[PDB]
Amino acid sequence: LQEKNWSALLTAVVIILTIAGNILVIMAVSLEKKLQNATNYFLMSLAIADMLLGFLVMPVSMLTILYGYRWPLPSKLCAVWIYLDVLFSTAKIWHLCAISLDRYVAIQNPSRTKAFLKIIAVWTISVGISMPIPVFGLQDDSKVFKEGSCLLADDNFVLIGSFVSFFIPLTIMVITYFLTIKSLQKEAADLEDNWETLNDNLKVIEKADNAAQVKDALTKMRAAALDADILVGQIDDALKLANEGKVKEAQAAAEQLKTTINAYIQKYGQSISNEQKACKVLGIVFFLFVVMWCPFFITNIMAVICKESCNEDVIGALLNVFVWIGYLNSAVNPLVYTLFNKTYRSAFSRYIQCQYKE
Numbered sequence: 516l517q518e519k520n521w522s523a524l525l526t527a528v529v530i531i532l533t534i535a536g537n538i539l540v541i542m543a544v545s546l547e548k549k550l551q552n553a554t555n556y557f558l559m560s561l562a563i564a565d566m567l568l569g570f571l572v573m574p575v576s577m578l579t580i581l582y583g584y585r586w587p588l589p590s591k592l593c594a595v596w597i598y599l600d601v602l603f604s605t606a607k608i609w610h611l612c613a614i615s616l617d618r619y620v621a622i623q624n625p626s627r628t629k630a631f632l633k634i635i636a637v638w639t640i641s642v643g644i645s646m647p648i649p650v651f652g653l654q655d656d657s658k659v660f661k662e663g664s665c666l667l668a669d670d671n672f673v674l675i676g677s678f679v680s681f682f683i684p685l686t687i688m689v690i691t692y693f694l695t696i697k698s699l700q701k702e703a704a705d706l707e708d709n710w711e712t713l714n715d716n717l718k719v720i721e722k723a724d725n726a727a728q729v730k731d732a733l734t735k736m737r738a739a740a741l742d743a744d745i746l747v748g749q750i751d752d753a754l755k756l757a758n759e760g761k762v763k764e765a766q767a768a769a770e771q772l773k774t775t776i777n778a779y780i781q782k783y784g785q786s787i788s789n790e791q792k793a794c795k796v797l798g799i800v801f802f803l804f805v806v807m808w809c810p811f812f813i814t815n816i817m818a819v820i821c822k823e824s825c826n827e828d829v830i831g832a833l834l835n836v837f838v839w840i841g842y843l844n845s846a847v848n849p850l851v852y853t854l855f856n857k858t859y860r861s862a863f864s865r866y867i868q869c870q871y872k873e
């Protein structure tokens with residue numbers, strides 16, 4: 516005991532910011548009805564994972580730092596504590612991958628129960644991924660102990676576990692994020708194309724002298740609206756006048772079509788800027804998970820590669836540092852939501868003032 520007493524002051528700060536911030540997230544998705552969507556339902560499940568990592572794993576870790584990385588508890592709790600840490604971390608990364616995938620599929624498409632079934636699937640996948648760690652590690656203390664330190668000692672568990680709980684969900688998540696960004700760039704682009712078509716043909720109709728010019732322009736306007744409804748019917752109403760030779764009537768109907776076009780373009784176009792706003796916040800969450808966990812997972816693989824060549828006491832001392840940089844990620848998602856989403860910031864501000872009604 517008290518082999519390192521300076522380090523555990525800092526780790527208590529990281530434990531408290533984790534518990535309290537993620538309690539504010541869980542409260543905001545439970546209570547604030549502007550946050551009742553499928554992405555925020557996933558962000559709450561991530562927050563429970565971050566909270567249970569802060570309650571269950573992180574105090575036991577600080578306890579080991581206070582005992583000189585020398586396991587202070589009953590010995591069959593070591594494999595359980597490895598299992599909790601690996602379960603919450605597997606759940607977190609496949610949540611971010613499910614968010615990224617479900618939001619990409621939403622931009623190639625037109626219930627809380629449907630979100631909640633998916634969350635349960637991610638958690639039940641994560642329990643089955645993490646399952647060999649107590650099943651094998653409780654039967655053999657050499658898979659979870661290294662010189663009285665509780666740490667995942669089995670090299671095949673580290674390699675299998677580094678890919679199926681960090682690198683293959685990351686790969687799917689970074690591909691789906693890029694494709695999502697490209698889809699939004701295609702949808703902001705196709706809209707601008709439809710705007711130019713509609714605006715150009717309205718100017719054609721306003722200068723038109725013959726029915727044929729008006730009819731052709733309205734046919735091209737109808738197609739643009741169909742590519743992007745009330746507008747289509749209004750265009751068809753102008754088309755019948757144009758087919759009837761009522762040029763002046765069709766021209767007056769077209770100046771009225773303009774107000775409807777402005778409303779629809781700005782709405783579908785407000786909702787493209789909002790999806791790019793939302794994608795940008797999830798990108799910071801995705802980025803901060805990877806960059807803060809990269810020094811732990813790269814070094815953990817390098818321990819297994821240069822097992823004998825490298826200084827196992829330096830590598831072991833760097834992993835003790837780098838696991839807490841990764842634990843610090845559990846404090847950061849609530850801060851990201853505060854900085855970039857008004858609804859979370861307002862929710863957090865009222866919950867701190869013990870005002871729980873909207």
Ligand SMILES: CCCCCCCC/C=C\CCCCCCCC(=O)OC[C@H](O)CO
Binds near residue numbers: 648651675
């Ligand atoms: C097919 C029948 C074989 C049964 C007898 C085998 C005995 C060998 C020991 C362990 C196996 C581990 C199972 C690995 C299967 C995938 C587990 C996984 O996905 O990850 C492991 C875990 O995440 C770590 O971090």
Ligand SMILES: CCN(CC)C(=O)N[C@H]1C=C2c3cccc4[nH]cc(c34)C[C@H]2N(C)C1
Binds near residue numbers: 605665811
């Ligand atoms: C139990 C706490 N201890 C002992 C000091 C740690 O070393 N914790 C780290 C272990 C991890 C690990 C190692 C190997 C394969 C893996 N697949 C998924 C993970 C993982 C999660 C990862 N967690 C987030 C940090």
Ligand SMILES: [Mg+2]
Binds near residue numbers: 711712715
């Ligand atoms: Mg033009």
